Subunit: 475 residues, 3 copies
Amino acid sequence: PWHHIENLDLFFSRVYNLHQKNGFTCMLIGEIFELMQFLFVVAFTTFLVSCVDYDILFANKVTLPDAFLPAQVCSARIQENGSLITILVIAGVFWIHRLIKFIYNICCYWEIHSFYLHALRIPMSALPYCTWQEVQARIVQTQKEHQICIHKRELTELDIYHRILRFQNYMVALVNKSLLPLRFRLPGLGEAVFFTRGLKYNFELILFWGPGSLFLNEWSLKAEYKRGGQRLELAQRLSNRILWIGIANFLLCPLILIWQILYAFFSYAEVLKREPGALGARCWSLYGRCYLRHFNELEHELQSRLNRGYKPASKYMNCFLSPLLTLLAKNGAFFAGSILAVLIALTIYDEDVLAVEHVLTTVTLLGVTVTVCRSFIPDQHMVFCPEQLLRVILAHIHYMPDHWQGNAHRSQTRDEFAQLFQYKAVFILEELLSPIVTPLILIFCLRPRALEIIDFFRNFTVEVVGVGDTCSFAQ
Amino acid sequence: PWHHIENLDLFFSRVYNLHQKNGFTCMLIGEIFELMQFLFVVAFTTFLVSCVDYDILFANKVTLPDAFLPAQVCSARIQENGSLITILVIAGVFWIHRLIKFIYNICCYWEIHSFYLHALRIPMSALPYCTWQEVQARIVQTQKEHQICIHKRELTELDIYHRILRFQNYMVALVNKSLLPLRFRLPGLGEAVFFTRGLKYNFELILFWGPGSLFLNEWSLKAEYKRGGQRLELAQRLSNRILWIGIANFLLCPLILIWQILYAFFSYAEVLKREPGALGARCWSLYGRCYLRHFNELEHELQSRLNRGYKPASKYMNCFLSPLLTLLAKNGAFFAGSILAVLIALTIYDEDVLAVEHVLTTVTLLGVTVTVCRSFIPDQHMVFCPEQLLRVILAHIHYMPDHWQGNAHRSQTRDEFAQLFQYKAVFILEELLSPIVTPLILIFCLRPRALEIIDFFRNFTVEVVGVGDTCSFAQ
Amino acid sequence: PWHHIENLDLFFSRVYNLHQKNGFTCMLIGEIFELMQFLFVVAFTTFLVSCVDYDILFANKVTLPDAFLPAQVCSARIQENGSLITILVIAGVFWIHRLIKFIYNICCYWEIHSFYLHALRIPMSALPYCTWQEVQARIVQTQKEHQICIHKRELTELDIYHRILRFQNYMVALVNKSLLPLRFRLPGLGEAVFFTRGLKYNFELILFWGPGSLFLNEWSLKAEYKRGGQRLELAQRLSNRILWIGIANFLLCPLILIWQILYAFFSYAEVLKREPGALGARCWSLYGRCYLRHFNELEHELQSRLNRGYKPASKYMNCFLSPLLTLLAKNGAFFAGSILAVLIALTIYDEDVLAVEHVLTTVTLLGVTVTVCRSFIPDQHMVFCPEQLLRVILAHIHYMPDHWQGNAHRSQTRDEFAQLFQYKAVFILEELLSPIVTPLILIFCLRPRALEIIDFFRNFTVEVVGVGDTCSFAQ
């Protein structure tokens, strides 16, 4: 609750994060769980690779620990692996860096916790329900009695928004004005959109937070980028910077692939064995979280809009079905149900046609076939592909391509609403492919745009008196 | 798209059908599947009857083809069956007639496909979503460039409706004015309605398309039927025509009965073994598809109205109270749950409840009793809308009996609202009974009405300038 | 159908009750069942205690009637119990009083039947179905022919409402103006509300129907209560009356506690046995039925409003959930699904991973763990605005505290919206506690309010020309 002591963007961001992860205790536990998941993936994997004797486990009454090798031997068997030891050393260095960041992260969050309790007066018990609007009302009312900020200017409730969302408004405006290569023309497919978690991380590491970024303070743009002249040397410097960051990505490719290959397999293989159709459900597409997002919109407001409008969008995506597939389903159901009805009447009649060594199995198969076809056979209604279903999905999100409103029922509309709707299997595939795809897009497709990026940041960056250097659109 | 290359109706109907079966390819496949279903039913049945050695299959490790007899013997075993060979010859003649009609139909449908692509400019890809609306308005614009009709004003298409629906408006007006015997007074039941697929086929074969029908052209009524005189000789001729068509039906009775047998088996017996309650769901009743029809209404508009209004109608069939029972359920649940609670508290206390000769059986029977009663006990706070149910169903249908609106809750209303919405099982039964019932209704109940049918077709048949001879009501 | 034979209330109320219990035959049967439930509870209550030899039943093949003792001995064993014989004599006297009231009631309900059939012309078959408005539309039109009572007033169309609901409007206005102690401040809990069936019965027995009540006729207030003077002696007399009625309650406490014990114990426990979560569902309360009730509102209109608005209220009560647990669920699901995915991949790979010392149990326990966690994981995309919903509950219930509309999401709102909506189990507990709690509230908390009760009944009691003495608010 101190008198404007440390850079603001961070203080406010931390305050917001503490409100989101409902309370200090919850947040601390969440971070600890995040650290234990990494360590568990890595240690479980290195235990499966190195310590388990699969041959004895498989064939050659056996108790579970009959497989495992004693530690006095596991250490030697894992140590005589140069590749494994190297991956483990890099993994442990990343881990130690994350644990050290966590330490302070909590040493700096105890300060926000005391801020809440003593200056805002919202106990951690009343915080999951304290709500954002009131807190906003609390912080802005607190600004007076207790000194905070320069005091040159009193808070105005949009300052806090700019502080929390400075770099995110920049991402919104970058993606909105078609910088930042996302569209690609793949052979054998339409124009794909490839925007992942790692790619946006790299874009922010290149532009916003790094050793030689565009920003020096986290609230002020470096002095040269405001100058009209020397734009070409700045463009060359940015191009070289992004070249070398792309090369670091290309060199780290195997390790992130491993983790990506690994964590992912673990994450959904359970779900696959349970309900293989959970991966057929659709999610709201990182490109699409950035496209449908307003300028000064905190994460919880975007997500509230995005799930208020989720079931209309699933009703839309499921409303168009192939007639042909429908006809094939109907007739395959007829022929399979006919052969099965005959075989069922026989097994009912005598019961020794049952479990024909061949028949029983087919009966099931044929049963699987009839069930699949009946699932593909449409049932009555839901065929609208309506202007109206779109007319509600839009009412939620509020943005649509302008060539969508008329032809809501075509393959052009579905195909590029498809890109926003993101069925998950692809997400998981698209997050797997990002280790190997992000360096080459970063080296080839973005380096030509560096001279346009420089002109964006020079042209669209306003200095607002209290907040510093913010995007020009987010005003 | 040759100008006046044909009478308007056999062209417009085909165009409409091509829009419905979404595209030429789809339609072709659908027809092929329709031809393969007939051939499969007949060949599978004759294989089951004639080639399989059931004794070895049942009792006397055995592979499946150990049952089947070699073809060199199947041919002789199926050939030495006069009844089977005769049924197969009649079946093959009907099949060959259907295959020849199919070849002629696709040779005539390639012309409609070229019509679409070249004169309407709707590719087969944009046709499942082109929409009827698009083409119906569009052709009317084509009427200028690619001319049709020797002397044609741009098609209002109001007329075009007339072309597609000439004979169907006649059926609607026949059933609407209570010609065409449908109501019957069966002993042991109320007034049944018996209107099937075969019966309406026979009515149309008698009245509209045949060797000596009422119509000579498909768009013009024969010249004598417009004359007021000679009505009695025309009535006698129509009566003799329908007598002999009924006798042809009576002679073909065994074959159509056999057909309705096997197709259903395969079609339904599978569904019975899977979900015996799927046949308890209700369907919209061929009488009822003709009763709830609306002026000049293409099939897809009727079906859209009919399924928009399907779930309200199931909630209605579902809704009525049976109140006195409710009380019996409540109080039987009380007394049974009381005795069971005592016996349960005892078996929990000591666990030596058993050895009583009937105890355990008493607990099980009492549990069944409580569960049945609780199923009959209405759920509290379950809303009831008799007025609404007999209101929203009408809003979707738009036609109502004048004695339904007041007493929505009586057995008179349910009993005759049932016929319109009758359940699938009585549908399958009523389609089974039509081979044996259609000839006798056709001979006995319709031949007395021939003099009224003649007066209908003389009185209600207007000559509209562009379309020809249409029903007088459908104007 | 005669003229003014009985008090209008004693006629109109009966007419309304006959419409509610749909018909005379129903009403009778319901009353008979009500009489048989009392006698059945008391019977075994006494057969289980007195005639059954539990020792032989438990331990010392045995048929059920091997336990029971012969009647020649049951009579002596139940007769040599002074406490049991005394409870049975009091129970039999209450029963005989109820049976005599039942005979008198059906002898008076036949008259009413005849009223329906002959003067209203609504047969008992068309009654469950008559609908309320129609009777209203029938009785008021009948007032001309079979003249109604005095016939002083033609039907008011409100008069019937006042007649049926005279004392209930008084209860509504008493509870509405915070007479009638309901709120209590218990230690260890918030302000509890204790309003039961027995408490409201006692309030009505004290105020409305008794030997020395406020009312002498059932439609006229005693003459002294209209006088401004002598208010203090009337207050003292009312205080003494309620003191002695409270003392009668305190003396009858053991018997009502037992009966409350017996009648309740039997019913609910079995249900809990079946589904222990049925008692976690919530019901509207005697209170809350009196708080949310309009003035001249018949019981069926209140209950229609109350169940139209029941599911919104359950959605509200279930909306608040722990942030912390969620996190535990998510991460336990991760770790369990990870170990299970590994073990599943192994059992798929070789199939002999199974049959290992812990193999056929770890997979099952881990599957249960993942399923439990996934049930605790909230559905992502799940939209709950607690604040928004209360709006629909209000649209149905129609009454609310002012300080709810803003803070719909707080514990203050839930805590006192809890009182209106409390779950069954506290209902059954609160009906159990009323025998022992009603006398002390009646003696201590209401006797101080007697001088305010007298001033209420003097100030708010209007004489309306046709109906007599009605509450002043219910106008």
